[PDB]
A paper describes a structure:
[name] is a binuclear metalloenzyme and a member of the amidohydrolase superfamily. This enzyme catalyzes the hydrolytic cleavage of β-aspartyl dipeptides. In the present study, we determined the crystal structures of [name] from [name] strain 34H ([name]) in its ligand-free form and that in complex with β-isoaspartyl lysine, and subsequently characterized its enzymatic properties. The [name] monomer structure contains ten α-helices and eighteen β-strands, and the overall structure is divided into two distinct domains (a β-sandwich domain and a catalytic domain).
Two Zn ions are located in the central cavity of the αβ-barrel structure. Although no exogenous metal ions were added to the [name] protein solution during purification or crystallization, two strong electron densities were identified in the Fo-Fc map. We performed an X-ray fluorescence scan using the crystal to determine the identity of the metal. The result showed that a strong fluorescence signal was detected near the zinc K absorption edge and that the emission peaks from this scan were unambiguously characteristic for zinc. The [name] active site contains two Zn ions (ZN1 and ZN2) with the ions being separated by 3.2 Å in distance. ZN2 interacts with the OE1 atom of Glu166, the ND1 atom of His205, and the NE2 atom of His234. Notably, Glu166 directly interacts with the Zn ions in the [name] structure. The antiparallel β14 and β15 strands are located near the metal binding site and appear to form the gate for substrate entry or product release because of the relatively high B-factors observed in this region. In the crystal structure of the ligand-free [name], this part of the β14 and β15 region (residues 297–312) was disordered. The final model of ligand-free [name] had an Rwork and an Rfree of 16.3% and 20.1%, respectively.
Numbering used by the authors:
A (entry chain A), B (entry chain B): 6 to 296, 313 to 395
């Protein structure tokens, strides 16, 4: 039914509001107000469903800016192509918005594949967007240019994951990179969309040089440049922390626990950023799912809380911080007028309930909706 | 506010429902129920606006399937290119959904212009779609084929307005036409969209021969072939009425009252269809606005009600019959779950209030929203 009243929820918006009741109307958050119960009169003719959550934590849904929705892989032979990621692999991990991309294999996979799968996820109830262009130069696009792709394909928000400082990159020049950045930036103005270039970083010692030079030498705003994997090695993390001062958002990768290799686990990188007093609103977390599994997002969250960080310190990294850089004006907050994408968590931060666009995909820890072929 | 309660409305859905109360929740119709005498208590914390209409007629918004949103013209020199049609030219005529197209001038105007303007009108709060391809062959498209424009550009729903039996046509062959129809039909299957070819008819004596042949000789469903301007001359209208038996929707043009003269005024054609016991669900009316003004849709409606036809007979031709052929599953009806696209009319059938996606564009005879540059 179309109106859902969520009573007695302890809201992290991500900022803590305390105990509230929330009215959902269709796919939107319509009201948030101090908790009552028996003293409210609901008209009998209105289709309202009332759920009492007994003070459970409610958070916005996670926005995963980096997922290989078509499947990634292929770097160890053709048998290593990962199949497309099922709906429930996102929704059950608390992901209510996904941004898809191609990675190393933009030779056998196409943007048509990517965008098709965005529409398919949208048809199944998930919010979904994608990055055009891919990993290599020349770019992989539908229309022949990034500029035209971002302008005319509504779900295309920018260029990604474009590779720098990696043995698998195209060895892009400074001139190539700043031209791509101009394209996405301008397309963002034309469209109101993110207008960012999301960079895959490898383990090359040149690290962020290209981005540092772009911001120092050119007029392109620093927010256009969005490096990911920045916790993959320690010198790179250190340089990424410095780049915050310029105004970039940086994206950590939620590596499977015990896998962060010679870099930092994401929970440790976040602990470091907190201690250092870095601008936390500029830091985000993504899964690399399909490339990775989206459940590492919540695992990283719980590992952080386990260190003694507060939910409101870390939760923006999965929600409002992502929506700010990606210009998703209606996502990432539990606030009136925003989309009804929300999670309920129990006291050990397991996600028990998942709502996407006002529809339950998981409720009382049970699957309500699964993908067509799951 | 995000909930609006429309009280004491006489609903034509288009089917007559009698007097009701209607709850709008964001952009959707959430409840429709019997108008009682006692005012109901609405919880004070919920942002609900209540509005009383004293029994006024409420209808779905008009869906205009044929408008030159960029402007048309150009057929008498370059100074005849019409400027883009303002937002209010649609809303104030009761048009809450428009489908744009290019016409004779697909040489100086592009699908990029068209689709840009679709997104513009959506940003201003109109629902808007477009036809790709245009008038001539080879087609005008963004991606270089209709099939790929329909598959990957969300707002693109089919091919139009493709000219047959007209001195300005490309003199298309049967093989050309059926291949186009194949493209749009399959793209409709892939996407769920209309998957139709909307044909501009001229005054050529060959009339609908190419369509008739396609239906007779091939497996293409009749609903694929959607001729417009079928009232423009009398023999064409006679042939278009026969095409209803094959299962095609046919589209009448709401010519300005002075002016249909070799053919039939749209109100006279509608009256003939009713009298002749034709399948009225298969007949639509569009404005050719920009090409033409959307206010002729209302004018036609009023002219047919003055002949003594009923509002429930004619109103589907502006609303549900259009939604049916174009596969707009959430438009065209005042029913729970459909989009909150609604008109209120006075007893002279003048449009006093216009709601698009739950937002008022006209209220009590006053403009509430205008276009950016109107
Ligand atoms: Zn990567
Ligand atoms: Zn990746
Ligand atoms: Zn025409
Ligand atoms: Zn026209």
């Amino acid at each position: 039914t179309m109106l859902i009243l969520l009573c007695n929820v302890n809201i992290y918006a991500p900022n803590p509001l305390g105990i509230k009741d929330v009215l959902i109307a269709g796919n939107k958050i319509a009201a948030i107000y101090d908790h009552g119960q028996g003293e409210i009169t609901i008209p009998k003719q209105w289709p309202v469903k009332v759920i009492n959550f007994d003070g459970a934590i409610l958070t916005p849904g996670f926005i995963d800016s980096h997922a290989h929705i078509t499947g990634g892989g292929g770097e160890a032979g053709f048998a290593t192509q990962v199949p497309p990621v099922g709906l429930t692999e996102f929704t059950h991990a608390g992901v209510t918005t996904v941004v898809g991309l191609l990675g190393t294999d933009d030779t056998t996979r196409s943007t048509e594949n990517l965008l098709s799968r965005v529409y398919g996820l949208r048809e199944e109830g998930l919010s979904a967007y994608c990055w055009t262009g891919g990993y290599h130069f020349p770019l992989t696009t539908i229309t022949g240019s990034a500029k035209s792709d971002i302008a005319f394909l509504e779900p295309v928000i920018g260029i990604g994951e474009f590779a720098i400082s990696d043995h698998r990159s195209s060895q892009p020049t400074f001139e190539e990179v700043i031209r791509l950045a101009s394209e996405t930036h301008v397309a963002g103005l034309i469209t109101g969309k993110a207008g960012v270039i999301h960079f895959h970083l490898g383990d090359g010692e040149r690290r962020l040089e290209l981005i540092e030079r772009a911001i120092r030498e050119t007029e392109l705003p620093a927010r256009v440049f969005n490096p990911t994997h920045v916790n993959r090695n320690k010198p790179l993390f250190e340089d990424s922390c410095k780049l915050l001062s310029k105004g970039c958002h940086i994206d950590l990768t939620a590596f499977p626990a015990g896998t962060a290799q010679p870099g930092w686990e994401a929970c440790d990188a976040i602990e470091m950023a907190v201690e250092r007093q870095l601008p936390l609103e500029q830091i985000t977390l993504s899964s690399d799912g399909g490339g990775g599994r989206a459940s590492t997002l919540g695992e990283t969250l719980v590992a952080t809380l386990n260190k003694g960080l507060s939910l409101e310190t870390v939760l923006p990294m999965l929600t409002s911080n992502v929506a700010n850089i990606l210009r998703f004006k209606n996502k990432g907050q539990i606030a009136v007028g925003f989309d009804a994408d929300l999670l309920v968590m129990n006291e050990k931060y397991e996600i028990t309930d998942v709502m996407a666009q006002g529809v339950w995909h998981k409720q009382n820890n049970q699957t309500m909706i699964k993908g067509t072929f799951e």
